[PDB]
Design a protein around this nucleic acid. Structure first.
Lengths: 42, 104, 74, 103, 205, 65
RNA sequence: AUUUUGGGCAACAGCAGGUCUGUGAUGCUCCUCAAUGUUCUGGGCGACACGCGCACUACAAUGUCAGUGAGAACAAGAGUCCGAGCGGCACUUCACAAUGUCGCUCCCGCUUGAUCAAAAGAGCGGGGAAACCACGGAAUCACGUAGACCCACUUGGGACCGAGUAUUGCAAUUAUUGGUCGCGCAACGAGGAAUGUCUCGUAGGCGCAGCUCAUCAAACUGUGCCGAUUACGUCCCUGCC
RNA sequence: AUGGCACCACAAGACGUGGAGCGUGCGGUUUAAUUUGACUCAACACGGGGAACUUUACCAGAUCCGGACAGGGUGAGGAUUGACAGAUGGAGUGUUCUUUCUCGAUCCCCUGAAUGGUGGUGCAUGGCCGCUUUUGGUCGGUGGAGUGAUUUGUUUGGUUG
C-alpha cells in the first residue's frame, strides 16, 4: 500500500526508504549514514 | 554493609567511547568502597541498511548496505548508593548511553 | 545441543579426545597419554579442526553464494 | 494570503516571537491523534501561522532559516520597529537583542 | 521516550539535523561544525565556525537567534541548552568552511579555476595536505562541463581515504544552471590523537 | 471559478433593532427578532426564524419557537 | 599456509548512459484557480490474440500419504505528543446531549498462561521496553523409525472452484489475506532449436531470519540445515591486458 | 604476430532454464486512466514500483487556493465567513439557490504581479548513480630524446597474479 508514509524528509511515498521510523528519500538516506553511524557491512 | 547491586550498564554506538567511560567512573567510584564484580558485556546489536542506489532508469539496478553495531557493557557493583551518587557527578559524553540500576 | 548433527558428532569426539588427554595429563603420565592421542590422531575425524562454515554470507544482487540471477543476454 | 482569521493571531505571533526574539518550529499540519496541538511553538495553528508569516516574511523584516522542514524565525531590525509599533510599546523593542545571558 | 536502538538513532540524527541547519545558517561564518555535549541540565553545543567572533558578537549575534530557535524548535522549555563558540583555528583546514567560502567566491563572481587555485594554495598553506576541488556544472549558452582542481595528494585508495579527506558540496545557480563546487580537503596526517600510523607507515627508530 | 458565495442581502442597514422614547423606562431591548443562547456568537444574534425553528447561521443551533 | 578468508576501500580519463520518479540541487521552458495547483470523490496503471524476460512450481518413489524424530541459526518488537479506549474531574443538563478539563490506560507495538469450540476463531489473568531476562532452556528444513500405495496419473498434480466461517482496510467492489470442507485427474510424466549460471562444509538442495507491510511476496537482504564431479589445466573457444 | 590473462573464457563437468503450469516484470494489446523512464552486455521483480484510494504522474467529476506584493478602485449606511430547513449538490460543501438569520473585513474587484504545480525537457544542468571495467593502471617533475605531434622515463631479460 502506497499513500500514508509521506516521507518526513520529503512528504514522498515514493523515493523514501521505509526502514525503522525514518522517512527519508533513498538519496537522503545515502547522505546521512555518517551522523547516524551506519558503515558499510557488505 | 547493606550493598546495592548497582548495575551500570553502558550501551554505546561504538565499543570505543564507552569503555573509556566505564573504566574511569569505576576507577573513580572505586577507590574504594565501590566494589564491583567484573564487567559483563551483553550482545552487540546490529542495525542493517541496504538501499537501492542509482536512478538507473537504465544502467545497473544495483544496491548498497550500511551498518551500525551497538555495543553493551555491564558492570555490577555491590556498593554504597550515596557513594555511587557521589561519584555519579560525571557529565559524560554522547554515543555512550549509561544506565545505572539498583536491583539485587 | 547442535545441528550440525554430524558436525556435532565430530565435535563430540573432539571433546572426547580432549577429555582423555586432560584427564591423563593428571591421572596418568605421558607414555599412555601420548599413545592414546597417537592412536587417536591416527584415525582422527578432526579433533583439532573446523569445517569452518556451514551455510555462507550471501552474495547480494544475486541473492546467492557463488552463482547469479540469469544473464538474460538479449 | 486571504483569511477571515487575522489580527489576534497576528498579535500572538508577533508578541510571542518578539518576547523571545525568535520562534522556531517544525513545519507541520497537526496529526498524533490530535486536537490541542494547534501547532507547536504557539497555541495557535499552523495554517494561520504559515499564511500570516508568508505575509510577514515576504516583504522583508523577518528571517526564516531552513533545514529539513523547519523554520527558524528570527525577527529583523525593521521588524522590531514595525512590531514595536504594532505591539504598541516603547521604542527599543526586546527581540533578539537581549543577550545579557545571550538570549 | 525512544528505546535503546532508537535512542542512539535520535542522537545520530540529532547530530545530522543540527549540522545541516547550521551549515545553511552559518554560511556567512564559515560553518565548519558543531559538537554536542548532552549534559546534566544542559544541552551543550560548541561552535566550530571560522568566524566565531562574528558568530558570537553581541545584541543578537547568531547564538542569540539560535538559542531561541533551537529551543523553540527542539521542543525545549527554554535554556536547557547552551552554545559555546569554538575557535576553530587556522580556518583553512576545513572542506566545509572552504566550500562555504568557495561558494561565496563563486557568489562573489570570482573566476572559478583561478579562484579555486588560489584558495587551494591558501588551503594548503593553512596546512591542508591536499585539496581537490571540482567544478561540475555548465558552460556554453547552456551545455555541461567539468574541471578538476587538486593540490597536495589525495587519498584515493582504502580506509585512510576515509580517515584523511573532508568534503563539502555546493550548488550555485548562476546565469542559469547548476554548478557544483565539490570540495575535498585532505588534512595532514599529523592528526596525532587522531592517529598517524597509517597503512603505509613503517618508519625506523 | 467565478463565484461570490451565497449570502442574504445586507444593504440598507441593520433593521434588527427598534428602540424608542417610550421603550426608555419600559424596555431596553427592542429588536426585530428572537434571541440566541447557546451560540458562541452569544447574546447579540437573533436567530433565523425559519419554519418554526430558530437557527443560528454561525453557531448552528437549532432552537424552536 | 595462498596477495590465508569474505568483503570494504580504491587510479586516471572516459561514457549529451541513466539520472525531471528523491531532492527544501536546479537552466531554460509551462499552468497558477472557470489551472493540469489543491483537496475530494471516483477511477486507472492490475484490462487477454499474443511475443518475451526473469522467477516459482509440478510432472513425482529418488516419491506422494499417516504418523514418529530430544535437530537453533541468524535475527526481530512497548514512539512523541494535556476531549483515542478507560477513568476521574469540571461545568453545562428536569433527563439527554454538550462542552471542557484532568488523570489513567496514551489514539496502550511483541505478546504468554489457557477455556469454550470441527475448525480456523472467539478470551480473564499474566508477562516481556532490543529483552541473551516474557513471546527464546523451547521450537529451526530436507533426518532417522513404524504404518496406506503389490507403481498404475496411483490420482502424480493441483492450477480450477463451490457454497461456508475468521480476520485487514475508511473502502476491496480490478476477489487485501486467511479459513473450511468438498473439489479437481487443466497444463504439467521433467520440456525442442536454443539456452543461464557455476570449481568448497562448498555447487546445491533445503529450509528460516529481516523488511516492503493496514493488509499482502515466489522480490528484497540476510540466517541456517544439509551436503559433492573434475577443473585445477589449458588457452583452444569466447573474451580482456 | 608475441606473451599472458578471465567459470558473463574455456575446460571437467555440475545444476537449471527453455517446453509446462502459476507470478511478477516486460513487450503487445484497450482506455477516459492506463504518469513515464529505461531496452546488447549496462532495460526486461528496475525505476526503493510489494499501485485498492491514497500512492500517481493519467481520466472523469467536483470544490478548495495555500492567487506572495504592490498599484488603483470597491468594500463595512457593509465585502464576507457561516448557515438551518429545504431547493441544487458524489457529498446535511451553502457548491449554487429560495428563504432568512447568523457572521464580520481579515473584503472583493480589478489592474499589475504572483505563486502550488508529481507542469516539460537529464543533450539545458549540478548532485547522484550506472557503464567504461574490473580492467592494472595514471601521472607530472626535472632530466633526457625528437622540428613537431610526440617521446622517454614507464622497458628488452628475468620474476610477480
Amino acid at each position: 500500500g502506497k499513500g500514508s508514509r509521506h516521507c518526513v524528509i520529503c512528504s514522498n511515498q515514493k523515493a523514501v526508504i521505509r526502514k525503522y521510523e525514518l522517512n527519508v528519500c533513498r538519496q537522503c538516506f545515502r547522505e546521512n549514514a555518517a551522523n547516524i553511524g551506519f558503515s558499510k557491512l557488505r | 554493609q547493606e550493598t546495592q547491586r548497582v548495575l551500570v550498564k553502558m550501551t554505546s554506538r561504538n565499543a570505543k567511547a564507552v569503555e573509556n567511560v566505564m573504566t574511569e567512573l569505576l576507577l573513580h567510584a572505586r577507590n574504594e568502597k565501590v566494589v564491583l564484580r567484573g564487567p559483563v558485556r551483553l550482545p552487540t546489536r546490529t542495525l542493517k541498511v541496504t538501499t537501492r542506489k542509482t536512478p538507473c532508469g537504465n544502467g545497473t539496478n544495483t544496491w548498497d548496505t550500511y551498518e551500525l553495531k551497538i555495543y553493551k557493557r555491564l558492570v555490577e557493583l555491590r556498593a554504597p548508593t550515596e557513594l555511587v551518587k557521589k561519584i555519579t557527578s560525571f557529565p559524560i559524553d554522547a554515543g555512550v548511553d549509561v544506565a545505572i540500576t539498583i536491583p539485587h | 545441543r547442535g545441528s550440525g548433527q554430524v558436525a556435532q558428532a565430530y565435535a563430540v569426539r573432539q571433546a572426547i579426545a580432549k577429555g582423555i588427554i586432560a584427564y591423563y595429563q593428571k591421572y596418568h603420565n605421558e607414555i599412555e597419554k601420548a599413545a592414546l592421542k597417537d592412536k587417536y590422531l591416527e584415525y582422527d575425524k578432526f579433533l583439532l579442526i573446523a569445517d569452518p562454515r556451514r551455510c555462507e554470507p550471501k552474495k547480494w544482487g544475486r541473492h546467492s553464494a557463488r552463482t547469479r540471477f540469469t544473464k538474460s543476454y538479449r | 494570503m486571504t483569511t477571515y482569521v487575522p489580527k489576534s493571531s497576528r498579535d500572538d505571533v508577533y508578541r510571542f516571537f518578539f518576547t523571545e526574539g525568535v520562534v522556531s518550529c517544525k513545519k507541520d499540519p497537526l496529526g498524533t491523534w490530535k486536537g490541542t496541538l494547534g501547532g507547536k511553538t504557539f497555541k495557535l495553528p499552523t495554517l494561520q501561522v504559515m499564511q500570516l508569516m508568508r505575509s510577514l516574511k515576504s516583504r522583508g523584516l523577518i528571517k526564516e532559516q531552513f533545514a529539513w522542514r523547519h523554520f527558524y524565525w528570527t525577527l529583523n531590525d525593521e521588524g522590531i520597529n514595525y512590531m514595536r509599533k504594532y505591539l504598541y510599546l516603547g521604542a527599543d523593542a526586546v527581540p533578539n537583542t537581549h543577550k545579557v545571558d545571550h538570549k | 521516550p525512544l528505546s535503546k536502538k532508537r535512542m542512539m538513532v535520535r542522537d545520530g540524527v540529532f547530530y545530522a539535523e543540527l549540522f545541516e541547519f547550521l551549515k545553511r545558517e552559518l554560511a556567512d561564518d564559515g560553518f565548519a561544525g558543531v559538537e554536542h555535549r548532552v549534559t546534566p541540565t544542559r544541552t551543550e553545543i560548541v561552535i566550530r565556525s571560522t568566524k566565531t567572533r562574528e558568530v558570537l558578537g553581541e545584541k543578537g549575534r547568531r547564538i542569540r537567534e539560535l538559542t531561541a530557535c533551537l529551543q523553540q524548535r527542539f521542543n525545549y522549555k527554554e535554556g536547557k541548552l547552551q552554545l559555546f563558540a569554538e575557535r576553530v583555528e587556522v580556518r583553512g583546514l576545513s572542506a566545509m568552511a572552504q566550500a562555504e567560502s568557495l561558494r561565496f567566491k563563486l557568489l562573489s563572481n570570482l573566476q572559478v579555476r583561478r579562484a579555486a587555485m588560489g584558495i587551494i594554495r591558501y588551503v594548503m598553506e593553512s596546512g591542508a595536505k591536499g585539496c581537490e576541488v571540482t567544478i561540475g556544472g555548465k558552460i556554453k549558452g547552456q551545455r555541461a562541463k567539468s574541471m578538476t582542481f587538486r593540490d597536495g595528494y589525495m587519498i584515493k585508495s582504502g580506509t585512510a581515504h576515509k580517515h584523511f579527506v573532508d568534503t563539502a558540496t555546493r550548488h550555485c545557480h548562476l546565469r542559469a544552471g547548476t554548478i557544483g563546487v565539490n570540495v575535498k580537503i585532505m588534512r595532514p596526517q599529523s592528526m596525532i590523537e587522531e592517529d598517524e600510523v597509517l597503512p603505509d607507515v613503517i618508519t625506523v627508530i | 471559478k467565478p463565484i461570490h458565495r451565497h449570502k442574504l442581502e445586507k444593504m440598507r442597514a441593520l433593521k434588527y433593532f427598534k428602540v424608542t422614547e417610550n421603550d426608555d423606562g419600559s424596555f431596553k431591548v427592542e429588536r426585530t427578532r428572537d434571541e440566541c443562547p447557546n451560540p458562541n456568537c452569544g447574546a447579540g444574534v437573533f436567530m433565523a426564524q425559519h419554519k418554526g425553528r430558530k437557527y443560528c447561521g454561525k453557531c448552528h443551533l437549532t432552537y424552536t419557537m
